[PDB]
């Protein structure tokens, strides 16, 4: 569906459009807020009384927001998860207009076999529950991720950019008796000042910092005792898009040495879908904060990118909410969320 | 050939034998003194009037002496070496009794293509020589040795049993600049008590020393740095035997987690004769030390060696009173040491 009628009923949806297109909005968590926001605006203005229509304007709304940004993938989640929560309320309200147990959670041979109320308010709360989410990820990863690190070891840090990463950094060095040192990559193109800001935020809090060169990676790798990074996308297979620059070497180097791999992951920032190629799915960077002038651009060629995908053959934990889990094994975590139908949108 | 020719002029050869067979002479050294001396003696005594008579004679008595001992690889050496030397001076003297072009040291195309003096006295002075090589190993590795360790690094201890091996590290812990933790292993049926004396010294010499199990091996891997052997007998393309005991296992966890492997022996232990055969060269030891009783026994058959074979793919250092040498470069060394006829006997 066209944006026709979605205009005088609702406002901001060209400001997003606008914050998402011309990167006015920062942040993937701030996008999240405002998708749910929109929401929230389309619930309480708008009446429907049929849902099943509803749920496919939902859709296709969605489908909209995905096609306008390739590489936001948040928005398109949160509102996956909130069409997720709507169906199975759908499927109980029928058995009750109306008026078979499965083995687990969920049926396989069900998709090939032919199988007034207050719905907007527990729509409404919906909203709400996520908000809560997203809002306390923190109070429910610190209780599983400090379990893991232990004195007298070294822990290098690949892009330092997420408010969550930092955090969870900051409870752990709370606990003094637990001694760490904390070795910090620069990111050539757009990680440098959050780098420079992230080792400032360290000292701050009295922590051993370490600024490190994105080349220096092979000398260091023999000390380095566990690795953690802070990602923007989790995918189905394991491997992730990272917050920018130099991840994918350093995993490559991590693998040959044989090091452990953390990673601080979301169920919202989960995706269902699958990345097949590199072609596609990798952002690319400007080169304009490399090299001044143009007139030698004529013959050279600036090769540069901005966000980074990881192979799941490197990575080894993703500590969330609910606990640390497997990349071998997060498909079914997002399953637990997210439907195989509600894909392709 | 018998010892028929050799009864009243040297005896001590039976002597030898003895000590060889029923173990009363103990550590390589030892053995390959004993050979220098049987040379000494045979020199010294016996009547000669021809070279190549001669030269085939000390032939003839090196295969038997293998044939008494196989084991002894230092006392087969040390007789290599003295015939090479041997070899050299006969062939100078054979250009001057007859009164040639090469582009290195030794040459291949001079094998396809045809070709009274004091040579005793220089005999005599080659063991002399290689008397004093075999005094000081130590003197001559301790200036490449203490270049590797560093601070905050961890060392991984398999075989103890070489006397050689505690002294490089000795001279490494002297040093008041560098500090390192070591891990040793046990090795249970054969250098149980030789560990823990090693373990003593190490207490003594006021260094961090902790006993590790041969089970509690795996668990400690991901903080071990390097890797040393306390090797007995070099060989031809690399391969080493070890001075009994828990040593394969411990190079394969190393070359798995890619551990740097060292190791520490000298030129007398190295041999111009190639392993082809595990199960010929290395010697068992045995079964009464396991396990008590006999009638049930005879039921319980149990397996048990003394030396271990590691092969040349895990180590790749060899450093020598000389300097570092390679798996891939050893085997000149032995040719620069023993001649290309004096490898068969």
Not at 65 to 87: D, M, Q, W, Y
Not at 325 to 343: C, E, L, T
Request: glycine share 4%.
């Amino acid at each position: 569906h066209p944006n026709a009628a979605t205009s005088d009923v609702n406002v901001t949806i060209d400001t997003f459009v606008a914050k998402l297109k011309r990167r006015q909005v920062q942040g993937s968590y701030a996008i999240a807020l405002e998708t749910l926001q929109l929401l929230m605006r389309f619930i309480s203005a708008a009446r429907w009384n049929h849902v099943n229509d509803l749920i496919e304007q939902i859709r296709d709304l969605g489908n909209s927001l995905e096609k306008a940004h390739p590489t936001a993938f948040s928005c398109g989640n949160v509102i996956r998860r909130i069409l997720a929560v709507l169906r199975d309320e759908v499927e109980e309200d029928t058995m009750s207009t109306t008026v078979v147990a499965e083995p687990l959670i969920s049926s396989m041979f069900n998709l090939l076999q032919k199988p007034k109320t207050d719905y907007r308010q527990v729509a409404i709360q919906g909203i709400k529950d996520l908000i809560d989410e997203i809002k306390n990820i923190d109070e429910g990863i610190q209780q599983i991720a400090i379990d893991l690190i232990h004195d007298h070891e070294i822990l290098l840090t690949p892009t330092p950019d997420s408010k969550t990463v930092l955090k969870f950094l900051i409870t752990a060095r709370e606990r003094s008796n637990r001694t760490f040192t904390v070795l910090v990559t620069e990111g050539f193109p757009n990680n440098t000042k959050n780098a420079h800001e992230f080792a400032k935020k360290l000292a701050q809090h009295n922590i051993e910092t370490l600024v490190v060169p994105d080349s220096a990676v092979f000398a260091l790798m023999s000390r380095v005792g566990k690795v953690i990074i802070g990602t923007k996308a989790v995918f189905v297979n394991g491997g992730t898009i990272s917050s920018n620059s130099g991840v994918s070497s350093v995993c490559e180097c991590a693998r040959e040495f044989r090091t452990p791999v953390f990673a601080v992951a979301g169920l919202y920032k989960l995706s269902p879908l699958y990345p097949f190629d590199v072609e596609k799915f990798v952002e690319f960077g400007g080169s304009q904060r490399i090299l001044p002038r143009m007139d030698p651009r004529k013959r050279l060629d600036t090769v540069n990118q901005i966000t980074d995908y990881v192979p799941p053959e490197n990575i080894d934990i993703y500590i969330t909410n609910v606990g640390g889990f497997n990349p071998s094994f997060i498909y079914r975590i997002a399953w637990d969320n997210y439907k195989q139908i509600d894909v392709h949108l």
